[PDB]
Amino acid sequence: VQVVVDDNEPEERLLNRFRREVMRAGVIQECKRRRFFENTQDVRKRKTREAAK
Amino acid sequence: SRRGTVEEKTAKSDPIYRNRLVNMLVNRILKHGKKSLAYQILYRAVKKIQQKTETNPLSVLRQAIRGVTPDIAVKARRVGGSTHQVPIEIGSTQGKALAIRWLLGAARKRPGRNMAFKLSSELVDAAKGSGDAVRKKEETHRMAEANRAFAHFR
Amino acid sequence: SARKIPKGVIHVQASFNNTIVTVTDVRGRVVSWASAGTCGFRGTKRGTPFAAQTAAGNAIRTVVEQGMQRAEVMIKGPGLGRDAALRAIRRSGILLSFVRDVTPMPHNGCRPPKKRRV
RNA sequence: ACACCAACGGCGAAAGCACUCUGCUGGGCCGACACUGACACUGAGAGACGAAAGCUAGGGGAGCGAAUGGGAUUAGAUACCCCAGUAGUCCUAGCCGUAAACGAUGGAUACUAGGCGCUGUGCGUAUCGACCCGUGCAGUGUUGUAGCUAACGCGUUAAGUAUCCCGCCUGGGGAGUACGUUCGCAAGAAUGAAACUCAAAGGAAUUGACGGGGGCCCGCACAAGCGGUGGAGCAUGUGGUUUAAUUCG
């Protein structure tokens, strides 16, 4: 689940924006809080239903 | 900003030396509408400074106020619920205006003799590093750069 | 004096309340550390990005005795001190080699309370 | 407990069920057909299954967390928030059988305009291709039509048009409680009143307002800035007090 700095060159550029798309605070804000058990399968799938079509 | 555009409000220039930015110093030291005696506060501080310094009175005025002129100040903006102390960078139009406000107050908050000596003292005290005029430049820098994280770079 | 270790991993424990920046060697032994609530300000004034740079820039006073040339970085956990800690270490004097994100990604089991963060 | 894959996905009668593997096992669907032959549908009582919480006995217990103990907030908070934390949550066996157990629209069958998304199978110059044209199951949304509906809305997975059978309602409060019977270890569950009292409860939708709802916009409104008040002495006005009245608004 790490990040690539496989590119050479003595460059000082961050390149931390490449992993801030898939991983980000997104996989940690979906987690680290409290799970609703039933509202996670209801409310989180209800807003994605109307935003699809 | 879009509806109704006003550039700036300007009056007549400096007496015989000709300058519009120095004419704001006679307009801020203006007490209750007396521009006739406000002329005697600036032009007598130009007559008494030539003995303390060597060069022209327009040069020593500009070389000293650069130590009173700020680069960054704090403004109160709220977002989300909490009041953020976000620092916005001050330009050359508002920075020259903020320099003459703290040199005005420092002159009045020193009850010695007349205003001809009080303005002339705080004019050379900005070059060496003394008085309440130069202290406010380093005091606004204590509020700024400490809250640097609330504002992102350009 | 000093051990004089070449390169080493920099574990940055980036959290919401503060950020603990610790520069360790190749094995896992800590030489000296630096934190956000140590560098002057405390309470809630830390955890911010430019408060993390004064924290990571306090380490180069205590670890300068060893004399490290190159340095690998390692960030752990979310917060406003992920990209900031990397910028302070770069302007200090030490080189870049391996920047990695070893943030513990859960397999959806253990869940802490809701609560609002800073 | 099990990321990602996960999906408006799938399976199951309902509840419900997701890392991988093995063992035993159920249901659904399609296709050339082969066979029985209506052997069907529904169904009071009855029997069985039941999210979580809770209960009994024996285990287990990382995290979370009723209770409980501190810190904080507040006029007070024996709440929200912070630090800890027991039963419990997990496993085996038995028990309790309730939930917005909700699509709140019981099951089964035949019909009635259409336009986009799954899974099986047939076919399409030899399938040359991601694919193209059909034909079934289950499943969403649709400016969804007719029709239906109080309206919202539903719309061949319709509350459309009909048939078969079972359950249920016939004012609000009192009540889903009391009494009795039955069931349970217990907490309680199931069946189920009346007196008295009101003339109203209730549903949809409409106008406006309100919102510590949202989107976009205008006034010193804030912001930027100057002077000022509240301090002081004096003037004046008002309450309170006082007085025979300290006249009224």
From Swiss-Prot, chain B:
The protein's superkingdom reads Eukaryota
From the Swiss-Prot or TrEMBL record, state where the protein is found.
Answer: Plastid, Chloroplast
Q: Which SUPFAM superfamilies match?
A: Ribosomal protein S7 (SSF47973)
Q: Please provide the Gene Ontology terms (biological process) for this protein.
A: ribosomal small subunit assembly; translation
Q: Name one GO molecular function term.
A: rRNA binding
InterPro entries recorded for this chain?
A: Ribosomal_uS7, Ribosomal_uS7_bac/org-type, Ribosomal_uS7_CS, Ribosomal_uS7_dom, Ribosomal_uS7_dom_sf
Q: Which GO terms describe its cellular component?
A: chloroplast; ribosome; small ribosomal subunit
- Short name of any one Pfam family annotated for the protein: Ribosomal_S7
Q: PROSITE patterns from the entry?
A: RIBOSOMAL_S7
Q: What role does it play?
A: Component of the chloroplast ribosome (chloro-ribosome), a dedicated translation machinery responsible for the synthesis of chloroplast genome-encoded proteins, including proteins of the transcription and translation machinery and components of the photosynthetic apparatus.
What's the name of the protein?
A: Small ribosomal subunit protein uS7cz/uS7cy
Supply the source organism's classification. Answer: Eukaryota, Viridiplantae, Streptophyta, Embryophyta, Tracheophyta
Swiss-Prot record, chain C:
- Name the Pfam families for this protein: Ribosomal_S11
Keywords, A to Z, come to: Chloroplast, Plastid, Ribonucleoprotein, Ribosomal protein, RNA-binding, rRNA-binding
GO CC terms, sorted? chloroplast; ribonucleoprotein complex; ribosome
**PROSITE patterns documented for this protein:** RIBOSOMAL_S11 (PS00054)
GO molecular function annotations of the record: rRNA binding; structural constituent of ribosome
Task: Spell out the family assignment given in the record's similarity comment.
Answer: Belongs to the universal ribosomal protein uS11 family.
Q: Which PANTHER family match?
A: 40S RIBOSOMAL PROTEIN S14/30S RIBOSOMAL PROTEIN S11 (PTHR11759)
What the protein does comes down to: Component of the chloroplast ribosome (chloro-ribosome), a dedicated translation machinery responsible for the synthesis of chloroplast genome-encoded proteins, including proteins of the transcription and translation machinery and components of the photosynthetic apparatus.
- In Swiss-Prot or TrEMBL terms, this protein is called Small ribosomal subunit protein uS11c
Question: Taxonomic lineage per UniProt?
Answer: Eukaryota, Viridiplantae, Streptophyta, Embryophyta, Tracheophyta
Gene name in the database record: rps11
